[PDB]
């Protein structure tokens, strides 16, 4: 039971930009003492992997609402072969951050006709 993530996708054909909205997460597991976590979401495209975005950290909550959006420059002919990675991490001051759960979206599964808004269950990373 690794919780769930709500996101959105849209593609800007004019500028060849993928718009990824990180809306919120729910029912996240507690990684810290005191029954909480400090979730933030790392977002990037495979196989590229260098261009990364991170939401703000939302401290001591298992149900963070992020309302953020990131844009990736992706030439359309390259798009179908990409995989969107959205990884929920636990923020921690004193050690390497652990992943709470993550979800991957193959871009060839997406109807890029209109804007799309989805819930997905997180998977172990």
Spatial contact of 23 and 6, defined as CB atoms under 8 Å apart:
yes
Give the phi and the psi of residue 107 in degrees, each rounded to 5. Answer: -70, -20
Quote the CA–CA distance of 107 and 79 in Å, as a whole number.
7
79 is in an annotated binding site: no
Greatest extent of the chain over all pairs of C-alpha atoms, in Å: 48
> What does the DSSP assignment read for 67-104?
EEEEEEE--HHHHTT-EEEEEEEEP-SSSPPPEEEEEE
User: For domain 1-125, is the CATH number 3.40.50.150?
Assistant: no
Quote the CA–CA distance of 121 and 4 in Å, as a whole number.
4
The Cα angle at residue 81 between residues 79 and 82, in degrees rounded to 5:
70
The b-or-e profile of 37-46 (16+ CB within 10 A means b, else e) is: bbbbbbbbbe
48 is in an annotated binding site: no
Q: What residue segments make up the domains of the chain, in order of their start?
A: 1-125
Structure tokens at 24: 């919120």
10 is in an annotated binding site: no
104 is in an annotated binding site: no
**Sign of the CA dihedral 74, 57, 105, 83?**
positive
49-58 long-range contacts, CB within 8 A, separation 24+: 55/22, 57/91
12 is in an annotated binding site: no
Peptide bond into 50 cis (omega under 30): no
Question: What's the burial of 34, exposed, middle or buried (CB within 10 Å: 0-12/13-18/19+)?
Answer: exposed
The method of structure determination was X-ray
Q: What's the DSSP call for residue 60?
A: S
For tokens 């718009």, what's the residue? 19
Question: What's the burial of 15, exposed, middle or buried (CB within 10 Å: 0-12/13-18/19+)?
Answer: exposed
């Amino acid at each position: 039971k690794l919780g769930k993530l709500q996101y959105s996708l849209d593609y800007d054909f004019q500028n060849n930009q993928l718009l990824v909205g990180i809306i919120q997460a729910a029912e996240l597991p507690a990684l810290d003492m005191g029954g909480t976590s400090d979730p933030y979401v790392k977002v990037f495209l495979l196989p590229d992997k260098k261009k990364k975005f991170e939401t703000k950290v939302h401290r001591k909550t298992l149900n963070p609402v992020f309302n953020e959006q990131f844009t990736f420059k992706v030439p359309y002919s390259e798009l179908g072969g990409k995989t969107l990675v959205m990884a929920v991490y636990d923020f921690d001051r004193f050690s390497k951050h652990d992943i709470i759960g993550e979800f991957k979206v193959p871009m060839n599964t997406v109807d890029f006709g209109h804007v799309t808004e989805e819930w997905r269950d997180l998977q172990s990373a």
